């Protein structure tokens, strides 16, 4: 099967957001608009905003899950490669083939898929911290898009769902990622080649 990337703002008006981080040389992580992809560092901080317009139940959490872009790829499991699954940089909770990991979050959960076989990372919907008017999940990409025996080169999509507690859906959106060694410069160029 093939996980849906319709966007679905749903009952409670979800929707994501992403910080204006500029593509300076020394930039770690960086969102295109025009490109509705982000261009990360590996194993870099991405911090991705949710966004609603009313308050969701308690007990309601959110998943990402990685997809292969390329429709003959999209059955394929969206994994890391043989050398990093193997690098014994695990955080304690992160099984080491799981390509998105959340930091600093105790109340992530991490699920491979007895069915799909497919990972994602889950935690808890919560509210903002007061001052805020969105919450913040901070995401690691632990395999750079290139990576041999594992991505190698083939973009991926991230699928973020706002999910109730029996994991029935509530909200949708995604986003390309290239993973790489200069998102800065990556960012300019994808977005130039765009514009020509
Ligand atoms: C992102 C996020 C987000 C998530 C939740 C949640 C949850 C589930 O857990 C609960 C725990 C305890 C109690 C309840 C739920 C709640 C709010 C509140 N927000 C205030 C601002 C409001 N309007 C501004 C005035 C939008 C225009 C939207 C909703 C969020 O913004
Ligand atoms: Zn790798």
């Given amino acids: ?17 992403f910080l204006h981080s500029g593509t300076a040389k020394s930039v770690t992580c960086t969102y295109s608009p025009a490109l509705n992809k982000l261009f990360c560092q590996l194993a870099k901080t991405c911090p991705v905003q949710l966004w609603v317009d009313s308050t969701p139940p308690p007990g309601t959490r959110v998943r ?29 909770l992160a099984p080491p ?5 959340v930091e600093g979050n105790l109340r992530a959960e991490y699920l491979d898929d007895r069915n799909t076989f497919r990972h994602s990372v889950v935690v808890p919907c919560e509210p903002p911290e007061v001052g805020s008017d969105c919450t913040t999940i901070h995401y690691n990409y632990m395999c750079y898009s290139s ?21 029935n ?22 977005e130039e080649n765009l514009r020509k």
């Fill in 147 to 167: 990576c041999m025996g594992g991505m190698n080169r083939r973009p991926i999509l991230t699928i973020i769902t706002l999910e109730d507690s029996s994991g």
């Fill in 97 to 101: 083939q799981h390509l998105i990991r």
């Fill in 1 to 17: 099967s093939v996980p849906s990337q319709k966007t679905y703002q749903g009952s409670y008006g979800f929707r994501l957001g």
């Fill in 169 to 190: 859906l509530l909200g949708r959106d995604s986003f390309e990622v290239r993973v790489c060694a200069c998102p800065g410069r990556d960012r300019r160029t994808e």
């Fill in 64 to 92: 990402a899950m990685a997809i292969y872009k390329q429709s003959q790829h999209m059955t394929e499991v969206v994994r890391r490669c043989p050398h990093h699954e193997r690098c014994s940089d695990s955080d304690g």
